[PDB]
Design a protein around this nucleic acid. Structure first.
Ligand SMILES: [Mg+2]
Ligand SMILES: [Mg+2]
Ligand SMILES: [Mg+2]
Ligand SMILES: [Mg+2]
Ligand SMILES: [Mg+2]
Ligand SMILES: [Mg+2]
Ligand SMILES: [Mg+2]
Ligand SMILES: [Mg+2]
Ligand SMILES: [Mg+2]
Ligand SMILES: [Mg+2]
Ligand SMILES: [Mg+2]
Ligand SMILES: [Mg+2]
Ligand SMILES: [Mg+2]
Ligand SMILES: [Mg+2]
Ligand SMILES: [Mg+2]
Ligand SMILES: [Mg+2]
Ligand SMILES: [Mg+2]
Ligand SMILES: [Mg+2]
Ligand SMILES: [Mg+2]
Ligand SMILES: [Mg+2]
Ligand SMILES: [Mg+2]
Ligand SMILES: [Mg+2]
Ligand SMILES: [Mg+2]
Ligand SMILES: [Mg+2]
Ligand SMILES: [Mg+2]
Ligand SMILES: [Mg+2]
Ligand SMILES: [Mg+2]
Ligand SMILES: [Mg+2]
Ligand SMILES: [Mg+2]
Ligand SMILES: [Mg+2]
Ligand SMILES: [Mg+2]
Ligand SMILES: [Mg+2]
Ligand SMILES: [Mg+2]
Lengths: 394, 122, 46, 157, 227
RNA sequence: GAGCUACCUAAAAACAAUUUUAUGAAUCAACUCGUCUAUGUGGCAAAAUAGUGAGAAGAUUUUUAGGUAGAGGUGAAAAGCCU
RNA sequence: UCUCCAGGCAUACGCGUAUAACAACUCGGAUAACCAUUGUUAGUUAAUCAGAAUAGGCAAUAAUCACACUAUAAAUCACCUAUAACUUCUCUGUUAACCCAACACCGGAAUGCCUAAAGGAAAGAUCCAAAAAGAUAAAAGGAACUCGGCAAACAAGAACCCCGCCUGUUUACCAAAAACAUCACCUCUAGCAUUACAAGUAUUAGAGGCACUGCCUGCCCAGUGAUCACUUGUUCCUAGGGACUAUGACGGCUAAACGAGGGUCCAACUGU
RNA sequence: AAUUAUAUAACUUAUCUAUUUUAUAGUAUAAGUUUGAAAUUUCGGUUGGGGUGACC
């Protein structure tokens, strides 16, 4: 067994106590009275010092076991930076949900109707992409810390222009950097989610249910996949000092209690600081699931049961170029067991808004091969981003 | 080639080198590089009302100065505390324990203006 | 090339090398100060 | 620390030589202190202890110079102070045992005040004296009061 | 003044920033020549005590999943991140190790030799004589210090009375107790010897500085005449 | 005494255009260097100037702070450097 | 106003009043005018420019327009879990033609942006001598000059020999090379942990030598029978008896390429 | 080259602590033996210069 930390770098052991102390019955003579060190006198032993009052600037916290909220049981907390090793599979097990590929047909059909098409939709989107990457900042190449929020904010301020066609869209408002948390148990393991969800869009009315009761009941045949030998708690924060809290994202009495969509942004400039696609979607499920679960607890109490009215929540995750769309329906609150009615989740993955962007022309031998604009722009991605928005109104 | 004889001050040296000119600190630097001034650490000048003041900067030459007698602890004691003890001694109402009755302070702790160590400036 | 410009002034370098705190670090440096005090020097160090 | 002549002839080169003592670490028990100390000790000291018929006898008998150790001198003060005060801390709850030790070393008993100033260096003795004579200045208020009361009392007399 | 960068007390998979010594001692003097310069490198802490039970876990054989086989600039061989239970660690990778494979760490000692797949740690006693082994250790619970270089392998020559003889790559034969645990197979990057540096500047990348330009027996007194 | 200089650690910075390709490759500035001739010779200069030349994405150059000290240090070894 | 020249404005390190006006005309500027000099008085104004709370838990995935694309040398506090505190503007840097070179030194000095919109003046008046230095032009000839085509040229093309394999490095201030380094190849040493090597483990680390690359090539390889027996050899017991013995320190050289290397030759070119 | 040489390594007898009846272990040391990293000091005279002969 190799012990980490070379001894030369460790703080050295205290010098041996003066031999005059060892002799019983002898009172050592030290430099305590002088109020300064001297090499030829024995080292004084001072009692521990107590100021007699509390100074905030120099406050020191108690050890872990002495904290008021300390609990022997371990609480596993999932937060933003947490990265699941198994990606989606681990997220499915924790939230007791079954995965359906592709968005719900109801959402998809909304944008197939040309009536929902926006005027100059293709041109305006290209301007937003060009504005997002080049025109917004004085600099030459803006960094991802300033154009992944801009692209998502711009599109939402474009999709929100449909209030002219649909006045019902006036019944929603948004927030920024909200706090969502929940506490639930899985197979004797206590799980909590603590993580902000950037901007939350909330409406006055709940979203229409996506799946029928018969489909929900049919999920019982499906069995959650297991991934031995990797444990479900890998990459989760084991916490022994915690409190049980379940916040929807706002407080009680908020006029718009129904959450429409949760948007997730990856604004880290460096690739190691940016989540991979698989990890991003896994983060979306837990964060999206938590908001749904907290409101279920708020409305129907803390009891565990199959919900008569399923709760539907939508999430949109992007790094500024690649978009992942998520629709989740919460069917049950009795997640303690691994067998029973399961939640349903619809995922649309790897939706490319544009393949690449050039902010300076590519010139070879005095020939402009590539223009300064988005490359391989895909309008279909914006339509899917519009379908989720329009859902619940049209 | 550096001048050893000139005083070392903040005007000299690189940007990083800084030091005060003797100005008393009036606040605290918190974390995140934010300054938080403290009102109590800022001196307040107690200025009297000079209305009806009969003293001016200069004195008349005609007025005769007196003999200089630097005040001593014994002189102050005789003027202030001795008469009280002397009268009390005749009345017999004097004891060692109650020296505070005449104004004795056993310890300066608890005084706003501590005589020693002095906690108040000029 | 052309010599004569060995001195490349830096206040951080100067004070670290021949400063007050540097001199007091070692007894051999403190004895440099002690002799200078004996002679009567205006400046004991940098 | 000295010099030697190579091959023990003065016509050869002069070579530096240092002769070192074969130090040993052993455990010794002091009856007067009733404690066991671990000390670096030469074979010479072991013979001296044996010739002194006990570790405690060796420390008390040996003068300051011959002892040649500050640690030993502290032991001398501790043992002397123990005997001088007849401290009951020696073998508590067994008075018979305590009396035996004290009687066995009764010859070395000296006055308590003298025992305290045994083995101390000049600096340690200076520090001890300074602490003994340290006193906060008397308030003049009290001093004047004493003078005033005495004068008034004498006048009334 | 010179404080070794190796001050981290707790194990973590995250790469740790390094400082090179240029050969200089902690006094500032060169104790080994030819060392200096090269690309900045991050240390990836390697666990060589294969059978290490997780916190509050029984000491019984367990398996782990090989997540990825990365390239380590601080070693000849290529490390592989292995994930099992609730912990992640870096281990030396065998020649045929691939991502997604499951390897077995087994302290259990078997009386009868059982065929072992590459990369599964087993006590030397368990291994049948003649199996290629690596990451061998002198004493049980001491981590691996032998045959941990790219392409190296060791042979279990003889198991007698709870003692095992291992033929080290240098052909030195070393005896250890059968309790010692060594994973099967040779280390990865078998073709390390076949590489060609080609250009002097390449060695300067690796940190190997140029060499200096500076360019017997005593006959007995009887033999002086003949020479 | 390592603010010059030899070497190293750490934190940093500079490299246009052209052709090759995918590089201790090519033409050639900034920049680094110092083959040759000439002038100078108490000189502008205790090693410079005018031309002419070598390298210029690399074993590259440069900046800042630190480390190695004379029985020694450093050295792609000239017994070269260390005010 | 005219003529002409072409590194300028900030920042950092540094310097420390050399800044600016007035007044003087001793000193300093290598001479004058004028001041950079002397004396006196002034000066540089920042919440943005610049400089100067505690205990835990846990990070596999570079950069390069980061998408594609590959590669190798493998590459920058945050976010959580709890405790504590609940509304602030003080201090310091800021001038100049400036620093290192005894000097108002044809030298040295990092970064940002720009190349004249910014910054400047080669000639104190004269004069046309020799010698010396620099620039330009040349009838005919074209290296006949010279140690050598040094320098110069309306030329700047071609091939060779020698030496080193190549890029690279060196005697700061007389030698830049054929010397040192260098990849590849070869030899010797070491079986291993908490400060170099090395958080490494024989395909590794140190030390030293040598251009590599196919090809000729050292020796060394018990003898005879034939995997078998004797003769040898080596040991003992005493000339006998047993016992035992189943190609590597060397050359040519690739061979090409490359060279401010050392020698040559032709052609053009020229005041050599 | 002459004189030394607790740099290192080594081993020997002792000291000394464990042990078994003499025994094999080691060693805050001393006395030797063996290597030498080094330190110190030296450059006789006559032969028209030099290597070889020589001579005093
Ligand atoms: Mg000088
Ligand atoms: Mg310099
Ligand atoms: Mg002598
Ligand atoms: Mg060589
Ligand atoms: Mg330096
Ligand atoms: Mg060098
Ligand atoms: Mg370029
Ligand atoms: Mg040079
Ligand atoms: Mg060139
Ligand atoms: Mg070239
Ligand atoms: Mg190049
Ligand atoms: Mg040489
Ligand atoms: Mg010098
Ligand atoms: Mg002025
Ligand atoms: Mg004037
Ligand atoms: Mg001058
Ligand atoms: Mg003036
Ligand atoms: Mg600021
Ligand atoms: Mg300025
Ligand atoms: Mg002029
Ligand atoms: Mg003229
Ligand atoms: Mg001409
Ligand atoms: Mg002509
Ligand atoms: Mg000729
Ligand atoms: Mg020429
Ligand atoms: Mg060469
Ligand atoms: Mg070269
Ligand atoms: Mg030279
Ligand atoms: Mg050169
Ligand atoms: Mg030269
Ligand atoms: Mg050359
Ligand atoms: Mg010709
Ligand atoms: Mg001498």
């Amino acid at each position: 067994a190799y012990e980490w930390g070379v001894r030369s770098t460790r703080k050295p052991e205290p010098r041996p106590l003066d031999r005059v102390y060892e002799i019983p019955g002898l009172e050592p003579i030290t430099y305590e009275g002088k109020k300064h060190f001297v090499p030829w006198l024995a080292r004084p032993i001072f009692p521990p010092w107590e100021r007699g009052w509390n100074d905030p600037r120099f406050h020191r916290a108690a050890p872990i076991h002495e904290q008021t909220l300390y609990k022997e049981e371990p609480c596993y907390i999932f937060h933003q930076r947490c990265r699941l090793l198994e990606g989606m599979k681990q997220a499915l097990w924790l939230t007791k949900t079954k995965l359906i590929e592709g968005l719900p047909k109801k959402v998809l059909s909304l944008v197939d109707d040309p009536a929902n098409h926006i005027e100059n939709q293709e041109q305006r989107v290209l301007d937003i992409i060009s504005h997002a990457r080049l025109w917004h900042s004085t600099e030459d190449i803006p960094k991802r810390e300033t154009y992944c929020p801009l692209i998502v904010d711009s599109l939402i301020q474009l999709c929100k222009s449909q209030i002219l066609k649909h006045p019902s869209l006036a019944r929603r408002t948004s927030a920024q950097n909200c706090t969502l948390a929940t506490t639930w148990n899985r197979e004797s393991l206590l799980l909590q989610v603590r993580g902000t969800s950037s901007t939350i869009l909330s409406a006055k009315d709940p979203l229409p249910v996506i799946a029928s009761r018969e489909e929900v009941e049919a999920t019982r045949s499906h069995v959650l996949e297991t991934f031995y030998p990797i444990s479900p708690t890998i990459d989760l924060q084991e916490c022994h000092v915690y409190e049980v809290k379940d916040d929807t994202g706002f407080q009680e009495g908020y006029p718009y209690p129904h959450p429409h969509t949760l948007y997730f942004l990856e604004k880290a400039n460096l690739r190691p600081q940016r989540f991979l696609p698989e990890q991003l979607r896994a983060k979306m499920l837990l964060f999206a699931f938590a908001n749904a679960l907290a409101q279920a607890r708020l409305l129907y109490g803390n009891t565990a049961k199959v919900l008569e009215q399923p709760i539907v929540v939508q999430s949109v995750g992007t790094d500024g170029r690649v978009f992942q769309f998520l629709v989740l329906q919460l069917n049950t609150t009795d997640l303690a067991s691994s067998e029973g009615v399961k939640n349903l989740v619809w995922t649309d993955s790897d939706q490319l808004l544009y393949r690449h962007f050039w902010c300076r022309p590519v010139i070879k031998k005095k020939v402009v091969v590539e223009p300064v604009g988005p490359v391989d722009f895909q309008p279909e991605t914006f339509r899917k981003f519009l379908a989720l928005y329009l859902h619940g109104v049209v | 080639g550096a001048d050893r004889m000139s005083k070392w001050t903040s005007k000299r040296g690189p940007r990083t080198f800084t030091k005060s000119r003797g100005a008393k600190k009036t606040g605290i630097y918190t974390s995140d590089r934010k300054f938080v001034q403290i009102k109590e650490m800022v001196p307040e000048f107690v200025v009297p009302d000079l209305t009806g003041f009969k003293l001016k900067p200069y004195v008349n030459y005609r007025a005769p100065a007196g003999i200089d007698t630097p005040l001593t602890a014994k002189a102050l004691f005789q003027e202030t505390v001795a008469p009280a003890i002397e009268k009390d001694f005749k009345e017999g109402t004097f004891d060692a324990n109650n020296l505070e009755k005449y104004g004795f302070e056993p310890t300066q702790e608890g005084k706003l203006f501590q005589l020693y160590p002095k906690n108040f400036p000029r | 090339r052309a010599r004569g410009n060995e001195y490349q002034p830096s206040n951080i370098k100067r004070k670290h090398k021949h400063g007050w705190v540097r001199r007091l670090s070692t007894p051999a440096g403190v004895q440099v100060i002690l002799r200078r005090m004996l002679k009567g020097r205006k400046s004991l160090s940098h | 620390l000295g010099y030697r002549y190579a091959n023990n002839d003065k016509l050869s080169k002069r070579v530096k030589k240092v002769w070192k003592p074969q130090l040993f670490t052993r455990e010794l028990y002091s009856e007067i202190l009733d404690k066991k100390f671990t000390v670096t000790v030469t074979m010479r000291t072991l013979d001296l202890i044996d010739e002194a018929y006990g570790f405690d006898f060796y420390i008390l008998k040996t003068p300051k110079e011959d002892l040649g150790s500050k640690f030993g001198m502290d032991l001398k003060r501790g043992m002397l102070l123990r005997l001088a005060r007849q401290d009951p801390h020696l073998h508590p709850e067994n008075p018979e045992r305590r009396a035996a030790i004290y009687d066995k070393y009764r010859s070395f008993v000296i006055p308590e005040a003298e025992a305290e100033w045994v083995g101390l260096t000049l600096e340690e003795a200076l520090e001890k004296q300074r602490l003994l004579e340290e006193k906060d200045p008397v308030p003049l208020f009290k001093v004047y009061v004493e003078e005033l009361v005495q004068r008034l009392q004498e006048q009334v007399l | 003044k010179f404080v070794s960068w190796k001050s981290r007390t707790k194990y973590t998979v995250k790469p740790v920033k390094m400082r090179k010594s240029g050969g200089r001692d902690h006094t500032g003097r060169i104790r080994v020549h030819g060392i200096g310069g090269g690309h900045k490198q991050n240390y990836r802490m390697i666990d060589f005590l294969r059978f290490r039970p997780e916190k509050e876990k029984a000491p019984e054989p367990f398996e782990e999943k090989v997540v990825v086989v990365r390239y380590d600039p601080c070693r000849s061989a290529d490390i592989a991140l292995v994930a099992g239970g609730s912990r992640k660690r870096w281990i030396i990778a065998t020649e045929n190790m691939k991502a997604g494979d499951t390897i077995l760490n087994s302290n259990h000692i078997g009386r009868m030799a059982v065929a072992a797949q590459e990369g599964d740690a087993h006590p030397l006693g368990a291994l049948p004589v003649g199996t290629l082994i690596n990451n061998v250790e002198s004493e049980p619970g001491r981590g691996a210090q032998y045959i941990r270089a790219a392409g190296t392998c060791g042979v279990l020559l003889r198991k007698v009375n709870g003692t095992a003889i291992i033929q080290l790559p240098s052909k030195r034969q070393m005896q250890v107790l059968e309790s010692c645990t060594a994973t099967v197979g040779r280390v990865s990057n078998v073709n390390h010897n076949q590489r060609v540096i080609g250009k002097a500047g390449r060695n300067r990348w690796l940190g190997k500085r140029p060499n200096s330009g500076l360019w017997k027996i005593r006959p007995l007194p009887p033999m002086k005449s003949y020479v």
